[PDB]
Swiss-Prot record, chain B:
<feature type="binding site">
    <location>
        <position position="57"/>
    </location>
    <ligand>
        <name>Zn(2+)</name>
    </ligand>
</feature>
<comment type="subunit">
    <text>Component of the RNA polymerase III (Pol III) complex consisting of 17 subunits.</text>
</comment>
<feature type="binding site">
    <location>
        <position position="60"/>
    </location>
    <ligand>
        <name>Zn(2+)</name>
    </ligand>
</feature>
<comment type="function">
    <text>DNA-dependent RNA polymerase catalyzes the transcription of DNA into RNA using the four ribonucleoside triphosphates as substrates. Second largest core component of RNA polymerase III which synthesizes small RNAs, such as 5S rRNA and tRNAs. Proposed to contribute to the polymerase catalytic activity and forms the polymerase active center together with the largest subunit. Pol III is composed of mobile elements and RPC2 is part of the core element with the central large cleft and probably a clamp element that moves to open and close the cleft.</text>
</comment>
<comment type="similarity">
    <text>Belongs to the RNA polymerase beta chain family.</text>
</comment>
UniProtKB/Swiss-Prot annotation, chain C:
<dbReference type="GO" id="GO:0003899">
    <property type="term" value="F:DNA-directed RNA polymerase activity"/>
</dbReference>
<keyword id="KW-0804">Transcription</keyword>
<keyword id="KW-0539">Nucleus</keyword>
<feature type="modified residue" description="Phosphoserine">
    <location>
        <position position="162"/>
    </location>
</feature>
<dbReference type="GO" id="GO:0006386">
    <property type="term" value="P:termination of RNA polymerase III transcription"/>
</dbReference>
From Swiss-Prot, chain D:
<feature type="binding site">
    <location>
        <position position="79"/>
    </location>
    <ligand>
        <name>Zn(2+) 1</name>
    </ligand>
</feature>
<feature type="binding site">
    <location>
        <position position="477"/>
    </location>
    <ligand>
        <name>Mg(2+)</name>
    </ligand>
</feature>
<comment type="similarity">
    <text>Belongs to the RNA polymerase beta' chain family.</text>
</comment>
<feature type="binding site">
    <location>
        <position position="109"/>
    </location>
    <ligand>
        <name>Zn(2+) 2</name>
    </ligand>
</feature>
<feature type="binding site">
    <location>
        <position position="66"/>
    </location>
    <ligand>
        <name>Zn(2+) 1</name>
    </ligand>
</feature>
Curated annotation (Swiss-Prot), chain E:
<dbReference type="GO" id="GO:0003899">
    <property type="term" value="F:DNA-directed RNA polymerase activity"/>
</dbReference>
<dbReference type="GO" id="GO:0006362">
    <property type="term" value="P:transcription elongation by RNA polymerase I"/>
</dbReference>
<dbReference type="GO" id="GO:0006360">
    <property type="term" value="P:transcription by RNA polymerase I"/>
</dbReference>
<dbReference type="GO" id="GO:0001172">
    <property type="term" value="P:RNA-templated transcription"/>
</dbReference>
<dbReference type="GO" id="GO:0006361">
    <property type="term" value="P:transcription initiation at RNA polymerase I promoter"/>
</dbReference>
Length: 93, 99, 199, 550, 83, 551, 104
């Protein structure tokens, strides 16, 4: 899907994965994160490898959606209150 | 800890993590890896992205925009080993809730 | 004096409080957050007046307590510029006077340039004395109905010190803090000061 | 009176990576490490202040406390310090990238060695919306090999050869691209050797090897003049005040917290920090007492050697050695880690319990708990588990009150007292019961079905007893191997495990949608021997045979 | 800005099995934090098995915000979905 | 308490963000901060970098920075046809904010030779708002004045001052970058060729080049050509200014006069005391026709090869002695030599006596072609002017012994420490200390020998070069950072005493005999505005040291 | 937390006292250590449809108009204290004409 045959080796994942900590658990050496600091890359926390590194929920499976508790207002008592000084001050000015 | 002749600890490592991702079970993976292995209430700073002590940031002397988060302690141990190698992992945060 | 303020906020309803009506469940949390508490840079909130707009309650994967974005209006004690306000005198200090307001907001100060024309402090009895006339010496006594005009509100942005400095002062305290919000009252014009001068 | 305090639950949306300044290292510091004396030996070998292991940097024991946060080993987060190096040195991780910007600047006035017409062409190629990582690293190579092509500057008339390595030296030969032309640089070159070679011609044997060296005291000063309108053309983006290229030379060095390097016996990193300090002291005292240039360089190559061993050390562990291997951080502390509320036991067969159940030994069920938070609906149930206590199995080990933030241990005290005072929000840790969701894997975990979820069943032996139709996804037999039981601890993690990882839902492999939990070796034989053509049963045998299965 | 009106909800009316596990895990989490239940529980105490009762009688007061990859979101009530 | 955050700033970014945050507001500094830190920028690019001002509030500043000459834009298009203006920065629009107290007190001291009058208050007032408004015509300034006795006076001195320099009209060449003005002018002389011309490509390159070289020098001298003075006697006053032009100030005549202020200061320490005054009037006459402090043809590129720098040194040494203004004799000095010289009456023979002594010194003050015809060299003295002041800033600060090594290393030029203590006369640990406190700055490099295969420092002797430009560019910006630090502490002091200064402007507009205040703060105000004037004292003292290395 | 606008509208103190009397009836257990104390200390501290017309007909400004109906002037100099330029911006004869509005 990047236009060429990449392969699942170290150069192919670098074309696929623009992130640092996902490729960091791949590698066996350490200078992949020094040029992350040099060229000052800024990756997101979207992939499920760095979701569990940083300890926040991945967005596949049960994290794929969001659950919402619906409120039972139905615009009933969300009419605003009186504030009849503005009825006074309308006659003032 | 490690070993059997300690109290114990059974390693859940790198291959069963793969298994529960494939089930999509995301809160088990959050619980079995972080909540019940090494959970750590940490104080990040919002303008710097570094971790402060006691609700107080050090690189900007203010307790003002300090956020309190739970994190794996190995990720805390990672960041303070990166700051010693002179790279700076600055956490960029945001709110969870739409407005 | 009393105004309303459209404030947007994110409330937390614990799930044991789901049995309540969801209007009263929100306002209970808002009164936990705003009653008897200085809103930064607009003054002292008292209660929560109504509700304007609620969203649908959103949930974390952490807990089950629903988090509602709510916009409301609250009554808030923000007196405008140049307002004649009453009170009851708490103590006459050497540099000015502090006057209570029946426990609502007791951080009032009237400096030398806001007194009458020639008020001097008496350290022998802790009282301000104003030489009015041929019958000169009037009496600024304690705990009576006062009448004074405010001039300027102050917003002392209080700032928590470092935890190494917050504990050393706490350690020696066992053997004053700046008020975050206060008012500059005045008794320039006649009619001000005591109400017994003009009742 | 008091201020409205507010807090929003937040979430990490990105990591940003940069080096630190010399002002970012000091801004996070708590002490300036200045002595090599770890301990003053007269006060019972206590950690000496302003050296390493200074209690403003954290604590290694649980007896002593920190001096910044005044927390012990359990609650101190650890605090940095810093370490001012006289005569800066090259960073070993940025040493490859220190090269790549010396291959891009003038080395006389330190302007960039590019024309303007391709410069703004290049910046269009980098500021365009179609930029990726290796795309930009491809452009940054494309504008670096082009930069090594140009032989003079556009700002001064200096000519520039190539610059490369030599260990930790960086060497520019001004020549090797002059050929026979380019007189006045060579003329002052061959002119200045005649001040020396006409005095002592011993050095004439080494003239071809003497090139313009780049030590970190002038490589640093050369970096301070790059005039950061073109640092983004070196892949820096100097809008951030730590963008600047001279932040990649070790002027200041952060001393890591004592949480990062404890003392069980000094640590490998603690003994490296003092050595760095000692060398710096030799250098700073040597620059004022008067030392030769031949041993100033001997110490300053040694100080650079130590910091090079401090980060990589390639037999002590550096910082990179703590992050590498399958015992380091990335696979060994972040992807895989020993967990709590788990046990490991030999497995064993049991046809009588259902395919979705597992038989847990009642000696393991006494130690593996569940944090059952009390409600209206289990208030009477959890009171019976309090009064049974930790030593009989329908029981409980701990009690955590609504506010007391420390677990009452039910082994002590009056358990009848705590059972009447059981509130409506406080957590008991009750023993593993019948029907609790557990996890269960064999390890080696080859496929998705290798970890499944069951309901606990509490039985009197010392072994795990799954059903035999379930031993096909674990690819196990009853020959002495063991399995791992994990008890989940939260209601969301207990419900995802039983519904997604349950046995009844995982009766088919996802590989082809074929049955994987089905009749095992000896349940196919007894089944064939019944439905064999010549088995004939009467009412006495049939209804007994139907009662076996029911 | 972003919303989908419930007469043009494009996605499936069937409850995804990943949705069924978070709904039962959320609702059991609320019930363990003393929330009121809506089903006649026959003397059982466990917060999961109460939550499984409420999904059977469709008495579970949550909705599911199905996010679409552009930014939109559909809202589906749990008593509307098909299990 | 020690300013370490400012030790890590780019000292030209830290300067240029401070010369506009104090003078203009804190919004002009944010724009020109990105222009220094990111090079060339559009408008739609600035609204993505700043993040805190929208597309029109930045356009409030862009039409105001170009008023004060602080932005040198260019309105060019791509091949698709969208005209996108890439605004730049320029330094000389910022240097007029930097030299702004020196410019006024230069034109005061230069206009004391024409009229003994209060013009030193009056011509200072007209130059005070040619800088604060940047670009202006004459009649709008003539609109504010009413009395024709003074309106004719200020119009007389406008054309009188512009006669001898210091002011030219504005143009697009003032607001276009010189390297991009050159290459478009270079491409005028490339596509004018006949199509499929048989000329070789290197000669095709050189055909475009030398045609443009005199063409580039033509465009620069087009505002230097006095066509703005052409308003000749419509009723009286045989030359006045042109009204319809927008008249600005140039810096290349000011810096040229500022260079001449440095050269008389060098002469007062080497060659007499009374004959240096003769040297002062000598350079003051041959002043406006002098070449610039910096050829703008250098910064157009043109140094990819070795020969064009030699081509630049052809015309550089040409103009210092083959210019019809810049060739003078001892006859011409007495025409502008004033009274009270007292060289024991004045006569041109004794002038040539003290014009001879400005040739025999080791510094090339005044060499000669003909024995009466003297001239001052510029390509030969300016690369030894900066070498002399650099030796005494080391001598003042790092001790006088550090001056000794910095010259002993300079002539021996590959010296070693065995040769130092032969050609120096100090104790060897004192040599090895004051050399050690001198490698910390780029005053010397260290040339290693690799006696073994690798470049090991165990058994190796080190040699000591003395590079010019590495030692100067460091001293150029060590001053430039200190110049910007000093204004940072100026503005920080005025901003923390804001409620004093607000009270010092409002309550006591006139009543400052009692301040309408207490004496416990006017003394505190006295030690603010003393330090507020003492900081600009140290600024002008530092700025003379800084501008040496700019040439 | 965000305050959208600092002053939506003013409040005459009869509206605030009518609000907090309804709050005391609605909240009569619901014990707040902060709310229930301060809503008690503000109502004793603070201790209409016919007066809201005649003040508006006087063409006095709405900024200082609210303090007339908040606290009632017991003296002419207090009525002088509310309105600035009481003698210059308008005449004298209507000032005591506002005094029976205070008693009424
Ligand atoms: Zn911070
Ligand atoms: Zn600590
Ligand atoms: Zn150059």
């Amino acid at each position: 899907y990047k236009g060429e045959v990449l392969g699942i080796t170290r150069f192919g994942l670098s074309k696929m994965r623009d992130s640092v900590l996902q490729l960091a658990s791949f590698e066996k050496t350490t200078d992949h994160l020094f040029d992350a600091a040099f060229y000052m890359k800024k990756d997101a926390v979207e992939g499920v490898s760095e979701c569990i590194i940083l300890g926040q929920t991945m967005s596949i499976g049960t994290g794929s959606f969001k659950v919402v508790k619906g409120t039972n207002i139905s615009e009933k008592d969300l009419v605003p209150k009186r504030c009849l000084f503005e009825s006074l001050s309308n006659e003032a000015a | 800890t490690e070993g059997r002749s300690r109290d114990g600890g059974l390693r859940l490592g790198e291959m069963e993590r793969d298994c529960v991702i494939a089930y999509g079970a995301s809160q088990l993976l959050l619980e079995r890896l972080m909540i019940s292995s090494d959970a750590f209430e940490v104080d990040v700073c919002d303008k710097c992205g570094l971790m402060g002590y006691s609700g107080w940031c050090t690189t900007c002397k203010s307790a003002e925009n300090i956020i309190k988060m739970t994190i794996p302690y190995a990720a805390k141990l990672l960041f303070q080993e990166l700051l010693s190698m002179n790279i700076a992992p600055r956490l960029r945060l945001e709110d969870i809730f739409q407005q | 004096m009393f105004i309303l303020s459209k404030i947007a906020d994110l409330v937390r309803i614990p799930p044991d409080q789901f049995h309540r009506d969801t209007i009263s469940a929100i306002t209970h949390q808002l009164n936990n957050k705003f009653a008897n508490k200085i809103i930064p840079n607009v003054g002292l909130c008292i209660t929560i007046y109504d509700l304007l707009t609620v969203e649908e309650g959103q949930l974390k994967p952490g807990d089950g307590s629903s988090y509602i974005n709510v916009t409301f209006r609250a009554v808030v004690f923000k007196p405008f510029l140049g307002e004649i306000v009453t009170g009851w005198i708490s103590k006459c200090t050497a540099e000015g006077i502090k006057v209570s307001l029946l426990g609502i907001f007791d951080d009032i100060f009237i400096p030398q340039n806001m007194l009458f024309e020639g008020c001097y402090y008496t350290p022998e009895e802790s009282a301000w004395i104003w030489p009015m006339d041929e019958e000169t010496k009037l009496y600024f006594d304690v705990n009576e109905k006062i009448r004074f005009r405010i001039e300027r509100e102050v917003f002392v942005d209080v700032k928590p010190k470092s935890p190494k400095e917050r504990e050393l002062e706490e350690r020696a305290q066992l053997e004053e803090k700046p008020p975050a919000y206060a008012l500059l009252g005045s008794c320039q014009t006649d009619g001000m000061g005591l109400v017994s001068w003009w009742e | 009176k008091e201020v409205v305090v507010s807090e929003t639950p937040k979430r990490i949306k990105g990591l940003e990576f940069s080096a630190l300044s010399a002002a970012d290292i000091v801004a996070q510091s708590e002490v300036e490490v200045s002595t090599r004396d770890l301990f003053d030996l007269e006060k019972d070998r206590a950690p000496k202040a302003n050296g390493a292991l200074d209690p403003k940097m954290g604590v290694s024991s649980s007896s002593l406390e920190c001096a910044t946060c005044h927390g012990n080993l359990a609650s101190c987060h650890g605090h940095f310090g810093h370490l001012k190096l006289a005569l800066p040195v090259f960073h070993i991780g940025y040493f490859k990238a220190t090269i790549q910007i010396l291959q891009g600047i003038c080395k006389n006035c330190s302007a960039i060695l590019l024309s303007e017409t391709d410069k703004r062409q290049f910046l269009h190629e980098l500021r365009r919306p179609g930029v990726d990582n290796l795309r930009r690293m491809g452009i940054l190579k494309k504008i670096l090999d082009q930069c090594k092509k140009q032989r003079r500057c556009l700002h001064c008339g200096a000519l520039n050869g190539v610059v490369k390595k030599a260990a930790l030296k960086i060497i520019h030969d001004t020549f090797r691209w002059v050929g026979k032309k380019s007189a006045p640089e060579k003329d002052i070159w061959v002119g200045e050797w005649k001040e020396v070679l006409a005095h002592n011609p011993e050095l004439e044997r080494y003239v071809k090897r003497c090139m313009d060296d780049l030590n970190p005291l002038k490589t640093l000063n050369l970096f301070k003049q790059i005039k950061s309108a073109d640092c983004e053309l070196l892949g820096i983006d100097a809008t951030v005040p730590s963008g600047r290229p001279e932040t990649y030379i070790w002027r200041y060095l952060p001393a890591p917290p004592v949480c990062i390097r404890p003392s069980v016996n000094e640590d490998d990193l603690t003994v490296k920090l003092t050595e760095i300090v000692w060398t710096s002291s030799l250098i700073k005292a040597g620059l004022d007492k008067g030392i030769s240039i031949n041993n100033m360089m001997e110490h300053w190559d040694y100080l650079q050697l130590t910091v090079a061993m401090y980060i990589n050390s390639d037999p002590i562990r550096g910082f990179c050695q703590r992050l590498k291997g399958k015992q380091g951080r990335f696979r060994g502390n972040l992807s895989g880690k020993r967990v709590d509320f788990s046990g490991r036991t030999v497995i064993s067969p049991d046809p009588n319990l259902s395919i979705d159940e597992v038989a847990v030994p009642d000696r393991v069920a006494k130690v593996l708990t569940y944090p059952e938070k009390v409600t209206r609906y289990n208030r009477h149930k959890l009171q019976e588990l309090i009064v049974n206590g930790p030593n009989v199995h329908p029981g409980a080990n701990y009690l955590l009150k609504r506010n007391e933030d420390a677990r009452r241990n039910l082994r002590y005290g009056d358990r009848m007292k705590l059972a009447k005072n059981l509130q409506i929000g406080d957590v008991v840790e009750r023993h593993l019961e019948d029907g609790d969701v557990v996890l269960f894997n064999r390890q080696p975990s080859l496929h998705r079905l290798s970890i499944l979820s069951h309901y606990a069943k509490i039985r009197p032996w010392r072994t795990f007893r799954l059903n035999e139709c379930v031993c096909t996804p674990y690819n196990a037999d009853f020959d002495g191997d063991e399995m791992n039981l994990h008890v989940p601890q939260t209601e969301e993690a207990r419900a995802e495990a039983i519904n997604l990882m349950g046995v009844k839902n995982n009766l088919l492999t996802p590989k082809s949608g074929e049955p994987i939990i089905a009749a095992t070796q000896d349940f196919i034989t007894g089944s064939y021997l019944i439905s064999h053509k010549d088995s004939f049963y009467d009412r006495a045998t049939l209804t007994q045979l139907l009662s076996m299965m029911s | 800005e972003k919303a989908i009106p419930k007469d043009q909800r494009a996605t499936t009316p069937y409850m995804t099995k990943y949705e069924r596990a978070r709904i039962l895990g959320t609702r059991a989490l609320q019930i363990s934090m003393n929330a009121p239940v809506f089903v006649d529980l026959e003397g059982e105490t466990d917060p999961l098995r109460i939550a499984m009762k409420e999904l059977a009688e469709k008495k579970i007061p949550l909705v599911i915000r199905r996010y679409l990859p552009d930014g939109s979101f559909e809202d589906w009530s749990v008593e509307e979905l098909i299990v | 308490i020690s300013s370490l955050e400012q030790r890590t700033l780019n000292p030209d970014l830290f300067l240029y963000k401070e010369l506009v945050k104090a003078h203009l507001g804190e919004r002009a500094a944010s724009v020109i901060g990105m222009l220094v830190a990111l090079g060339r920028l559009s408008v739609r690019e600035l609204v993505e970098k700043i993040d805190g001002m929208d597309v029109d509030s930045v356009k409030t500043t862009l039409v105001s920075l170009t008023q004060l000459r602080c932005v040198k834009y260019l309105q060019e298009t791509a091949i698709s046809g969208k005209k996108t203006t890439y605004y730049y920065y320029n330094e000389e629009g910022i240097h007029i904010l930097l030299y702004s107290g020196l410019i006024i007190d230069e034109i005061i001291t230069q206009m004391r030779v024409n009229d003994e009058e209060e013009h030193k208050q009056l011509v200072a007032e007209i130059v005070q708002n040619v800088i604060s408004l940047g670009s202006l015509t004459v009649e709008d300034y003539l609109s504010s004045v009413t009395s024709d006795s003074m309106k004719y006076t200020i119009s007389s001195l406008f054309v009188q001052l512009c006669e001898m320099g210091y002011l030219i009209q504005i143009s697009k060449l003032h607001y276009t970058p010189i390297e991009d003005l050159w290459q478009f002018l270079y491409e005028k002389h490339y596509k004018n060729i006949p199509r499929n011309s048989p000329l070789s490509d290197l000669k095709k390159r050189s055909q475009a080049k030398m045609n443009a070289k005199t063409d580039f020098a033509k465009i620069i001298n087009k505002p230097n050509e006095l066509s703005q003075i052409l308003t000749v006697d419509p009723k009286t006053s045989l030359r006045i200014v042109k009204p319809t032009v927008s008249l600005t100030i140039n810096l290349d005549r000011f810096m040229k006069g500022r260079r001449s202020k440095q050269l008389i200061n060098l002469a007062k320490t080497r060659v007499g005391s009374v004959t240096a005054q003769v040297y002062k009037i000598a350079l003051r006459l041959t002043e406006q026709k002098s070449p610039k402090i910096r050829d703008p043809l250098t910064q157009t590129g043109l140094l990819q090869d070795l020969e064009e720098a030699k081509s630049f040194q052809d015309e550089a040494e040409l103009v210092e002695e083959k210019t019809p203004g810049l060739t003078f004799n001892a006859i011409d000095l007495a025409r502008h030599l004033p009274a009270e010289l007292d060289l024991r009456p004045h006569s041109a023979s004794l002038i040539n006596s003290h014009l001879k002594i400005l040739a025999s010194s080791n510094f090339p003050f005044l060499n000669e072609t003909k024995p009466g015809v003297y001239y001052v060299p510029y390509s030969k003295l300016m690369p030894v002017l900066k070498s002399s002041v650099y030796e005494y800033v080391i001598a003042s600060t790092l001790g006088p012994s550090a001056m000794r090594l910095s010259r002993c290393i300079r002539d021996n030029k590959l010296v070693s420490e065995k040769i130092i203590n032969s050609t120096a006369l100090m104790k060897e640990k004192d040599i090895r200390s004051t050399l050690a406190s001198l490698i910390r700055y780029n005053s010397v490099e260290i040339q290693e020998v690799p006696r073994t295969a690798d470049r090991s420092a165990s058994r190796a002797v080190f040699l000591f070069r003395c590079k010019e430009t590495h030692s100067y560019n460091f001293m150029r910006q060590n001053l430039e950072w200190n110049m910007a630090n000093l204004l940072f502490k100026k503005e920080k002091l005025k901003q923390e005493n804001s409620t004093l200064l607000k009270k010092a402007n409002r309550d006591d507009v006139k009543g400052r005999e009692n301040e309408l205040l207490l004496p416990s703060e006017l003394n505190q105000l006295k030690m603010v505005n003393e330090r507020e004037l003492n900081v600009f004292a140290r600024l002008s003292r530092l700025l003379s040291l800084w501008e040496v290395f700019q040439m | 937390m965000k305050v959208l606008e600092e002053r939506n509208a003013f409040l005459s103190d009869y509206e605030v006292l009518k609000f907090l009397t309804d709050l005391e009836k609605k909240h009569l257990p619901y014990n707040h250590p902060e709310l229930q104390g301060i809503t008690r200390n503000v109502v004793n501290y603070l201790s209409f449809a016919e007066l809201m017309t005649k003040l508006n007909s006087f063409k006095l400004f709405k900024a200082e108009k609210l303090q007339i109906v908040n606290q009632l002037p017991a003296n002419m100099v207090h009525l002088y204290s509310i309105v600035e330029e009481c003698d210059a911006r308008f005449d004298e004869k209507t000032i005591e004409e506002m005094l029976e509005i205070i008693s009424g």
